[PDB]
Write a protein that binds this ligand. Structure first.
Ligand code: CD
Ligand code: CD
Ligand code: CD
Length: 28
């Protein structure tokens, strides 16, 4: 299962990360 980021289509890691198995440079 992909991360809500790639799943949903619109990442939302602006501020704090909550989702699991992430891989964004805006959080990581
Ligand atoms: Cd993200
Ligand atoms: Cd994240
Ligand atoms: Cd994510």
């Amino acid at each position: 299962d992909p991360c809500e980021c790639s799943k949903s289509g619109t990442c939302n890691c602006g501020g704090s990360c909550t989702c699991t198995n992430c891989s964004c440079k805006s959080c990581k």
